[PDB]
Amino acid sequence: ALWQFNGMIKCKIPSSEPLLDFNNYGCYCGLGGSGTPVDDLDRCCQTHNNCYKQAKKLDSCKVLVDNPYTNNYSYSCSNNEITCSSENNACEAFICNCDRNAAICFSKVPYNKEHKNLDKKNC
């Protein structure tokens, strides 16, 4: 769920408020997405978007009427390291991995304020 993703990002980037810093950024960081990523961070979000799309197509995910952003899974942050729980069922585990990968990706790429609240004309 979004609440967990927010926590994961903070786990990797302690100084951030993810739902603010990484929302409405570039062409893919936020709800939906289209076009060519404007930078590596935007690309992290495109990959995350693609991961969610793959998830929704999994047999295990079609069983729950909850979208990836509302589907709660279990994970832990410790020493700024993210660990997806073995107690997660197939769908939740896949989503957890998608979020973990994105959180780590976000923490390894540059952040360009110029792309915050990007004109969707550029997408």
Contacting residues toward Ca ion, per CB under 5 A: 35
Tokens of 15: 């100084």
Decide if 99 is catalytic: yes
Q: Which residue is catalytic, options 39, 48, 66, 119?
A: 48
Query: Is the CA virtual torsion 15, 80, 71, 96 positive or negative?
Result: positive
CB closer to Cl ion, 80 vs 122: 80
CB closer to Cl ion, 41 vs 82: 82
Decide if 48 is catalytic: yes
71 near 99, Cβ under 8 Å?
A: no
Q: Which of residues 67-106 bind Cl ion (CB under 5 A)?
A: 81-82
Which residues are catalytically annotated?
Answer: 48, 99
Residues near Cl ion, by CB under 5 A: 81-82
